[PDB]
Amino acid sequence: LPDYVAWKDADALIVHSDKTLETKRSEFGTSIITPEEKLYIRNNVNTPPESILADRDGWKVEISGVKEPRTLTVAELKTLGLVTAATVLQCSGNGRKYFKDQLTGDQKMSGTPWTVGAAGCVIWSGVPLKAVVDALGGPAEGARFITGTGGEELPAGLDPKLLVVERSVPISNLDNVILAWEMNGRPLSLAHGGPLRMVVPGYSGVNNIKYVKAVAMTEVETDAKIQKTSYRVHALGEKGSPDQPSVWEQPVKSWITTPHEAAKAGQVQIAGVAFGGMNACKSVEVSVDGGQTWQEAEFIGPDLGRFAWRVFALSADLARGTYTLVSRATDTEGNVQPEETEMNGAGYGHNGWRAPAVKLTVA
Amino acid sequence: EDKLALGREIFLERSEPQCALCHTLADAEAVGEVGPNLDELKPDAERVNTAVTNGIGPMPANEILTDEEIEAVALYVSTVAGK
Ligand code: HEC
Ligand code: MSS
């Protein structure tokens, strides 16, 4: 494992690269919450040093686009409010392997071949952005986005807007947005963007700015590369452009996580995780024969809110053989996972129920 | 056998921006820390080639570089990654 994540669980993680660590499917557990030392890692650029955690409460955050712009410290943010929320953190790339599986002939695609482990469910704690904005007089008239900026010190000798991690989402999110300083009951880790993190519930990982150093209410999206042309949904062979949809709201998804490989004939408890992105998951069906037959599954554990995943489970009674385990989720507004997700050039947002099927040898 | 040194030139000098500025590759004494350390990625030639052609994140779709060059850099990287 790489040093800045030396504390993580080497056995629980696939090391695609030093910037890129995926959780093994067997490691999610059945508690909803993803063990911090097993949560995935995805970094677009270089990583800050530990020294920025020396003084967590002195970390500064420039808040502009409000009737009273100010730089605030984490110390002051702690005074303004408190909020806690469970959300699913999941990269837009999660599932890219499954898009690569469908490429025919010359068709080629780059990116980390994530399967399902670039996703976790965590409990964030910190101050809500609405509180922080109302503290500062409200947002400037005609603000249309929340725009946050990563704190990484960019290496000299390249154009900042090519590498800065600066994302914009709609101001309709203000009510849900959180500047968290705490994850799963602990001071936020360096790996996961401590000492402070913009958290945009229901949205892809890219929008949750690690080490956020500025947060602006803007009339326009940021022109940073990472917003203008990256993280955009386009057809194969197209280039990304700001008229295309960006990776914002997460769509309804689920996968099977247990059993992952082998099982004795008889009763077998099949479980996994499901969520509706911006909406709560309403129901889930499981199939053991890879689509031909569906049964309604059961929710397991408590409901941590609309942006969290549920654990579900099915008790099946199985004869010896090779099964094909798949899950299909419906959210509260009636959106179902498709069998397979329409292709896109970059490979974002895979949410098909067939691709991530588990193969189970019942012996 | 010969087209390697071309890839290495492409990697350290000829590319705009230079790969070494973003990437770490032991063989090239490159220590770029923005994109993946390529020794850890240990990518095949096909992976390199597609990345540089199609673009990925801050790498844009290639436009100022010909194919003999791309394949050269794809050959060099894939070969030396983690030697
Ligand atoms: C800074 C502008 C960079 C330049 C110059 C080069 N690379 Fe790059 N590269 C960079 C980043 C931040 C990433 C990761 C992006 C992501 O979304 O994961 C990459 C990625 C690659 C890869 C992996 C491709 C894949 O399929 O995942 C390769 C093989 C690669 N880069 C090669 C490469 C070459 C050959 C370059 C010179 C022609 C080059 N990169 C320049 C950042 C930057
Ligand atoms: N600052 C910053 N932030 C940030 C980054 C970087 O690189 N930087 N990344 C992204 C992404 S992109 Mo895709 O959509 S996913 C993601 C996430 C992840 O997280 P973790 O690592 O903690 O897991 O984050 C986010 N944020």
Residue numbers in the entry:
A (entry chain A): 37 to 399
B (entry chain B): 29 to 111
Give excerpts from the publication.
In most cells, the detoxification of sulfite by oxidation to sulfate (Equation 1) is catalyzed by sulfite oxidizing enzymes (SOEs). Here, we have investigated an electron transfer complex involving the periplasmic SorT sulfite dehydrogenase from the α-Proteobacterium Sinorhizobium meliloti, which represents a structurally uncharacterized type of SOE, and its electron acceptor, the c-type cytochrome SorU. In S. meliloti the SorT sulfite dehydrogenase is part of a sulfite detoxification system that is induced in response to the degradation of sulfur containing substrates such as the organosulfonate taurine. Electrons derived from sulfite oxidation are passed on to the SorU cytochrome, and likely then to cytochrome oxidase, as S. meliloti is capable of sulfite respiration.
Despite the dynamic nature of the SorT/SorU interaction, it was possible to co-crystallize SorT with SorU, resulting in the crystal structure of the SorT/SorU complex, where a single SorT/SorU entity is present per asymmetric unit, and the application of crystallographic 2-fold symmetry reveals a SorU/SorT2/SorU assembly. In the SorT/SorU complex, the SorU protein docks within a pocket adjacent to the SorT active site, with the heme cofactor located at the protein-protein interface. The shortest ‘edge-to-edge’ distance between the SorT Mo atom and the propionate group from the SorU heme c cofactor is 8.2 Å, which is well within the distance for fast electron transfer through the protein medium. The SorT/SorU complex interface shows significant charge complementarity, with the negative charge on SorU correlating with a concentration of positive charges at the SorU binding site on SorT. In addition to the electrostatic interactions that support the formation of the SorT/SorU complex, there are six hydrogen bonds found at the SorT/SorU protein-protein interface, as well as a salt bridge between the SorT active site residue Arg 78 and a propionate group of the SorU heme moiety. Specific structural adaptations of the SorU protein take place when the SorT/SorU assembly is formed. A surface loop on SorU (residues 82–93) moves away from the SorT/SorU complex interface, leading to a reorientation of the heme ligand residue Met 87 so that a different Met 87 rotamer coordinates the iron in the SorU structures within and outside of the complex. This change in the structure of SorU is required to allow a Mo-heme edge-to-edge distance of ‘closest approach’ of ca. 8 Å within the SorT/SorU assembly. The structural change in SorU indicates that an ‘induced fit’ mechanism is responsible for the formation of a productive SorT/SorU electron transfer complex. Within the SorT/SorU complex, the SorU protein shows a significantly increased average atomic temperature factor (reflecting significant flexibility) relative to the structure of the SorT protomer (1.5 versus 0.9 Å2, respectively).
